[model samples]
Target chain A: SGFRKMAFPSGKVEGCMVQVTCGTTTLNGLWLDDVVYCPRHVICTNPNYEDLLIRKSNHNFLVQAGNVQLRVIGHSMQNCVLKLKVDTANPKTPKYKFVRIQPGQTFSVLACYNGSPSGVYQCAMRPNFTIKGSFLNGSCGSVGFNIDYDCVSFCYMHHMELPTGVHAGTDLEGNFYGPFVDRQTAQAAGTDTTITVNVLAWLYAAVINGDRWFLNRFTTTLNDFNLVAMKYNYEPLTQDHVDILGPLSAQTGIAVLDMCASLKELLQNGMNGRTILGSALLEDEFTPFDVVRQCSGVTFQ
Target chain B: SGFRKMAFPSGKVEGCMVQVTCGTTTLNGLWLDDVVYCPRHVICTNPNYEDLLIRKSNHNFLVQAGNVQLRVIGHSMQNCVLKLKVDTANPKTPKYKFVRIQPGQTFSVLACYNGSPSGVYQCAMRPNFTIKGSFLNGSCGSVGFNIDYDCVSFCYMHHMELPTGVHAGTDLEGNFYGPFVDRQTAQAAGTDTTITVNVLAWLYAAVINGDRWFLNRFTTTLNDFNLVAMKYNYEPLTQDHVDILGPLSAQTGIAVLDMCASLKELLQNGMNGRTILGSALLEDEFTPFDVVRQCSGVTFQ
Candidate 1:
């Protein structure tokens, strides 16, 4: 439990990356075991992330005094343009309408089809029809994660408030459903996806708040700092102990500030704002030029 | 047909009101009958304009194999929030939903009410419910006429091409419906209202185009040059065919220019934009200082 009282980098620096050479390293007075990054790795590295699900509760409309209501819910980081294609299940009677819905927003529609006299002598009992929905645009496939009102709220809590455990692996049956109401199973799949976004957001907040000091703690336990920063296209922190950390320190601090502001902006705009911002951010593979341009007073480029 | 060839104010001056004591007057050689304000009046003075009817065609959802669809169309100058209240026509049970619609946009809803178990046990058939609609905000009352694709096209064509005779008086039943389908009555009440709007728009175009010239023609007839100029709170065109038409002339000319631009802006933004413009113009008793301040290029206070 005792280690040498050697001073690792005390404060955080923004310009250069953190590089540690272990073998002879000591933190306190005595020699210690190997250093490790703490907590979990970058959340995006997990391979089992489920695509957000959006489903409609009802789809069929009856014929006699017929009336139908459709309620749709979304459990994703985005909103989508849903085109409801209604037909008598016949190729000849296809009709379509469009509506927009945000993640976690319930979109409802009610309609009654007036029966026609042409079907008076017909064999079919006025025809029970079906409606199908397809995304016109604004989804993960076309754009990146679109944070909504739900995702913004999730950023402030610990993993305990999450529906599924933060450690929920591929084993959970409906784990990927985000925040969904399983009408068929009549169960709520919890806002697990929302929790993940919140975790990412807070992790950013911690990075911005603690600066290099907080990120360095992860260095002793795991390499998550580099992984998370890399996802947002930050230049890796590769410098060993340095003599002059003045300008570099301020640079890295501002970089994190930039990331913090961008994340908070996504929070303010909600899903629609997120979609537009994500589309803009993801355009050029997300370069450091992009990050630096969004912020000012960076000591280094 | 005989009239005086008197040199009535010869040229239209912006600063002074047009005053003509015409006992006898002639344009070429014949005497004129009377003078009138050309193109049209403000058209906003009509009391019969009902802000484009948006009544529900049908709103009964049945119990036996129930289905119902409600569609709403918008024709006014601004987007409106439409509230649909549904119940059994009984005071006890009431429900409401709000939706938005833009000019020329059609909002439709489909709904079905499940047959009650009590209805199954009863002798009489299950009862149907009713639905009502009301505008919460954003209509002719507040926003002004919103122009959709339909209104832009209406700004062209001769007054003779109008459905109702250009001479149709206040006696016409639905003269104000404006370019309607007339689906029930099937009578072309004429896009008379639309025609009137186009006439006003063109009158403005003529003023803007003719500037000093077209306004002068009205000087000989109705002294409209004076009436229109006074609305903006301009000093009367009282130079008495004077020598120096200084700052006041330029100020009044620019005032008309401001009105011309404002009217065209309504054309671009459609009715809602116009309503906001009209509200702003109608404020503080229509002062010239208010009108002149909204535009540029005027040297005068």
Candidate 2:
């Protein structure tokens, strides 16, 4: 039936991402770890048998109410032309920029709405060119929401920094924590703390599948999402308080399985597949902008 | 001296365009034939042993004054974006267009100046893309000079049609002639043709050194160049023409030696080396465009 199939030994499937393979040749992007992350459908192996790498990941730094700094994590062995469009969710107000990136280089751009910061701001990046047998014509987008200044301050007031030597430990209220080890060891950490199951599921998939590419792409977003999710669902990590944190073994297995199943279903179901997969299974009132919403308000100064 | 070298014997040198070879791989554009021309300094050979084909040739069909239609002849195994800039040779007026050519497909574009048709029109094509193991970033340019309409009409009126049952045979003037004879008959030719010591020299080199590729490229261009040269000179294929067209015996040896000597000198001298070789012996004012100028005007009306 030409039906694609993915099997995870464990029956519970919560956050799975499946990659297809046929014999020795396997599909790329199955593993999105640090070194390589190609989000392209067509890639040609180099005549010399070298790994072909092409990717574009967004970095949205919230600086102020109307300004957002955007950057990308990517490199191309050949010259690449990048086209970006920023929509500040305001009618008749869109900004466009073009940039050229040489071999083995990255670039960033800042987009400003300059109007009311009460809606949403979206930035889309289109990487254009063919390099080393790979056609890089994919796009990665980031969305930032606008809220009242007082709402941002309210989230900031509730934010708290993590203590030392507390990696994956309780958050001083019996709430289990799983902050990155490097950040855990660092003397300073951000104040806002929230955990979203969606980002956690993605990170868990990266771990089980050894997708360092995806892991790297998700590095900054994971923490930020956690903080946002926490602000939206602010609660003490008390034992008596119902919490999203669970042991890695169970969480990892469920997440991986779910991702794979969801991917297979999406691939079979064509229309709006990605959009559906992106926002599915979110807890009530939790969106991608929660972190940006709470954190954008927190100005240390 | 890190230099490149090419050698042609007497018979081959006349039509021969030298291509320097470092070991087995010869430089491209060595033979500027009508089709299958590659104007690139770098080409990646596919590791999987597939033909790596990327070419950009111009096809300018002259319709009328101020209405020049232009197109391109090329194919790539990967998607390619072709950027073209056309200088109508008008002051402060340049036009640009972009096109996408998919794998294994060819594309064309039309450009018109729509103003004055009395100067040279230059069109440059840049194919941008990355393909298996090679970064193909190159340009091919063609220049078209516009003369008076009468000149085009003159060439059109004078162009002659070949007679049936008589291919490559002498004209009414008894000068030697040899057009394509299906590669069958018309042997024992080349004696009356005074196969200039240079041409003989090149042909001999191809035979002795086994530069078959060079030999083939020269074959068609040789006849065409000779015909063009003869028309410009307007000389009958007679013995009195004694011409640079020498009896191959003595002329062959001397021409072969001279070509060998000149190639060695050019290899040592890099600047404008091709310019030095292209027009060494013109015999007359015949260039590539003479035929076009004469024939394009033929309307049969």
Candidate 3:
């Protein structure tokens, strides 16, 4: 028998009806299959696929509780595989597995694992039927994927996190929920990212020029950003933020505006650097018109 | 004296720049013209104003933690007055006074009441500059003006509120941050006023007949309306979301797919005569779409 290279049609999957089912009966877990997974199709199309019996296995059933009973209910015969995974601390090496089956076959699986005193055991799979695999925690309809810690949170709203990893700890009531219980992920931490701009340019000119004043402005904004990001569950601050406002506001003082004004003033006066009081940025303070004229590069329409 | 409402014959107050210099002095607290008060104009039409006279009031200048010197630089010839109120907390009735000034005159005022922490003070009316009010946050330049919070955070993005009361806290926190603080204000809370289409015929059908399992059979779509509104941040969930899920993936159980499929199985399906299961709104679920749908009937799409 010679087997040559096999090719997979890579792209978005099509024409497959993935029916997700959940209940308290024998068919409690989710299931999926391509249209070809039907035994009728196998018998009709591929000679090698004929006579295949479809059935569910205990292993094929993903359960989120130690005692939840699971069974596959209905389907036609065909090759279909269910992928499974358990979240853990290691980002690179998570626990993963898969099971294959044919329609009509049935199986039973129990969520019993890591026999801890008091634990919250759950299961998750693609075709995310559960949002957090947190069903056994006393809520259903929440079983799909794991929750990431960096998501933001809303006020007066309900929220949940998926099992991240096991941590050893006991509850205040001593009704221990974990020895290696799943880690509870957090969303949003310090302040949110933000930028504050002020009008009143003349006042701004006066304020931004002073080193101390500028610093107060800088730190306040930085802190505010951190506060929001942190509060809203953003990642920890990055180095870029620090670089922008380091060295206290006062020490970093510069007169860029005054220079612009001075330049414009000088240009207006027909000479640059001419001494003029109360003038700062572009043009020289000496001849206000000179500075204004210099900056008036564009003619008024 | 002849008075003309619209025409000026022999008067000359247009485009003339006058500068008056006051002595290097300061005042504790008081109005400049303690005789007649009128609105003052301080625009410069002519260029050379270095010769304007500015004066100062006599008093010890002690404002905040800093000691600043004060003096008048210049003013218009028209007698102008300023009305100053000592307290801002009580605005029901205000204390009033009048200040008088001659054309092209400069003056300094003093403030030395028991609670008045003194400092240099000068007031002038500017004519050349147009007072451009601050823009709403995130509009035009980064600088913004804060408005009332009465109906600020309640509405979804894409809509703005015409504030009703005193400037409610800083609006810089931005819009789309609304919940209509109070409902009693005579002013319409835009969130309360704007119309939205929240009905999901298919999903609601499933809800009414307890056909949660069929929710996956329906489709969801956010048409042009949703996109435009979303550009302004106005969004929740829409019936259109079902469209993307396809017949197999979209359904009632799919609405609460995670919960219903979760070991928690959030089946409001049989709870409290509430046959609707899409309320994926378990204590830990956050389906904003369902929220806007069930509670407000304001569809995100």
Candidate 4:
């Protein structure tokens, strides 16, 4: 978890006694990782990755292909018609339309926004999502809403983190190299933000393996896991900060996305297997948060 | 986060106000994932993945190549001698050695048991690890041992969880085909428990991406984050159980170990990348838990 800053003693909020508010209600108890506390009942927070924002007719946001939907019902749904657009530089075009979603009335916006930049002068945005609405809930924040991918960049959190999405590591020779993230360039992403690639191989993959085990709290398996690159950095030493994971590869190059298919082909040999890898790259997003990243192929020279 | 059963109503243990024990002293707080609560200090619960046991030359266990070490201190150091062995089916040889005393002494073990089988009766064990020792620390259970891979199969948890270990998912066609674990045979793990493989592609890996995001609890941005499979199964629907993740492939094939490199090549290709993939398979372990699963290749016919 990026939440290494939570508990000083351990990293856990330790007995989350914080009561949660859901619209007009309150939840006395909730799971540790849940970000969305629905107004009426429990709902899944993960959405399908394919769904992208396409249309905004009136208050309803249509999906390119999605199952997650959201509706922001506010007292003045009629006052401010929901305005949206995916610009070449920002919004596809700048415009707005009005609609009346009576107090209890709700309309759905495709829960995911795997789209480009945004508004007026094209104020860049990530995933282009922000709920707490009615086009009204602000400042003091009293706008209630219904959504699946609430307060999260499903695009980043769910897309770029995949194994196929720029994974790198080392060989037993103990060499280290993986994509180095360009966080600054990452802040401004459109369609795709290519990055650098360093194929470190199995060792790095093993570090990720160690991570998966730790993620599950399946501790105790560390002794023989053998994939540690940083000597003596055995976990638990930093147990309270177990959520913090340093980059595994010393081979740090900003990850980029270019010639992704021919990319894997120019491997140890010639070019082939492009069919499988060719389809690997398609308008993709980046980072587990809003920041975007990609891996560059070629240019090893 | 496998702590789904930990919290109800929402699935979090809530504020983890539970006091944690680390041998004798107590900590006011600790991190969420620290499994090893050190006696007087903090340490990483994650160990290197390769430190398997090979010999117990007297009291000191010889490592094949490792860094983790452990020791057990109790009221009766002279009274009991630690016993261990990795039979052909269990211990490499049936034996027990003796040594120690003074009160504050430390000895180390291989920490990982990627080795095959166990003792006299050849009692099969998992990672052959357990720290509550002293050759005593009986029924009541105050063994007070210091082991790096304590109470777990470092071989399994960290080894098998790697992305290279065996990742399977779906194609955009929405077809699901990945590894289907046979849990029964899983209990009988030895040097290497081979499994089957069904390459499902991008969709499955995307699901794991979603999981990583949820893990961070960075909520929001979910509105446009697609990649969800299993329709309607969008997460948080079971937020209280956010820790639970189902297998992603409908192309459920038992992930195996035979010709693992050739496996990826036979994967819709003629053959070649074997050099990069060939080294992929070695004396590998399985699963993020003690359980093991493999993906089969070559016999897709």
Give the winner by DockQ. 4
Two-chain DockQ for each candidate model: 0.01, 0.01, 0.01, 0.02
Q: Compared with the real two-chain complex, what DockQ does model 3 have?
A: 0.01
Worst 10 residues of 1 chain A by lDDT: A117-126
Evaluated on the second chain alone, the candidates' TM-scores are 0.19, 0.17, 0.18, 0.18
What's the CA RMSD for each of the models? 32.6, 30.6, 31.7, 23.5
- The TM-score of candidate 4 is 0.22
* Poorest lDDT segment (10 consecutive residues) of candidate 2 chain B: B152-161
Q: Candidate 2, residues B1-301: lDDT per residue as tens digits?
A: 0000110001110111122211233321111122221122123331221233322223321111123332223322211111222222223111211122221111111110111110111111111111111001111111111222112100000001122111121111112123322123333322122223333333333232222222221122233444543543322222322233233324234333333233333223422312221122211211112222221221100
TM-score per candidate, chains pooled: 0.15, 0.16, 0.17, 0.22
TM-score of chain A of 2: 0.18
Superposed by TM-score, candidate 2 places the C-alpha of residue A225 at a distance from the truth, in angstroms, of: 18
Label model 2 with its docking quality class: incorrect
What would the per-residue lDDT of candidate 4 be over residues A3-64, giving only the tens digit for each residue?
A: 00000110011111122232343222111122211111111122221121121122332211
- Poorly placed runs, candidate 4 (over 4 Å): A1-194, A197-301, B1-19, B24-189, B193-301
Q: Encode model 1's per-residue lDDT on A1-301: one tens digit a residue.
A: 0000011010010000111111222110000011111111111221322331122111221112113222212112212111222222222111211122223221111100111000000000000111111111110111011112112110100011112211111101112223322122333233211212222223332232232222321112114444543454343333321112223335555333344334443333423312221121212121232122112211110
lDDT per residue for candidate 4 within B245-282, as digits (tens), equals 13332332212111222223333243333322111111
lDDT of each: 0.19, 0.21, 0.21, 0.18
Candidate 4 backbone clash number:
126
Interface RMSD of 4: 23.6
- In candidate 1, clashing pairs total 57
